[PDB]
Design a protein around this nucleic acid. Sequence first.
RNA 1: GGCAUUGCCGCGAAGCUACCAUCCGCUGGAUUAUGGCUGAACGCCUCUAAGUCAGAAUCCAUGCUAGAACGCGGUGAUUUC
Length: 189
Amino acid sequence: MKYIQTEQQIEVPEGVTVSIKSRIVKVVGPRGTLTKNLKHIDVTFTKVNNQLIKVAVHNGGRKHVAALRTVKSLVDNMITGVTKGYKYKMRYVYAHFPINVNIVEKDGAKFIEVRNFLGDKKIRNVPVRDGVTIEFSTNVKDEIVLSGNSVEDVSQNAADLQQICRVRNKDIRKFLDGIYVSHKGFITE
RNA sequence: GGCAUUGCCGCGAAGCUACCAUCCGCUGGAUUAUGGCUGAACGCCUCUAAGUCAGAAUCCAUGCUAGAACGCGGUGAUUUC
């Protein structure tokens, strides 16, 4: 039933600093600074070393032990986007009507717009999330490479363009037009 | 000028009136269905378990009507001298 002890270990890379007090994880490193708040989990961190953090739990059930290894992976995605970073290559697919994507800075921030998506006359606004720079691949005419130091604000922004460029009232297996993600790489690789 | 239970006919202002006439009828947040993201369970996978995003003529506000005659606030003046 309730497992008496369940531990995981977060290997902390070189040059990377981690600051934890009352389940708030501030990570600084060679590029970027990430602060994720974890008050919703009963989890005890402990500094067993300067190179690796032990994360443990006590008397947890199957529900709670399952929500322990999701904590190690969330810190591991924090330090990985802080050492290397994250970049998402996205790709334009269209049958006839070309998609024309730009970047505009309106009153608030860098809205992303698409125009002529399947011949449509309505622009499709989608804001950037901050910490994410927006990049176009110059060599390939139909490509877009999102990038940033958090995997969350990139991938939510990468799924934002997938959600906004959908089809309506047609066969999706015939009308396979849209802006899909193909590659989820790191920045320094 | 009277009377004809407003004698009858034509025009008729005021008033009332008619999609028979004209004018007017608000925009913000959260969400269901559903599509997603990060990601475990289950050394893979997964939209869900912990998180999170987009979203219905829906919902709660904004707006509109009443104002508790036992809800309340602020000010004015307070007697024959």
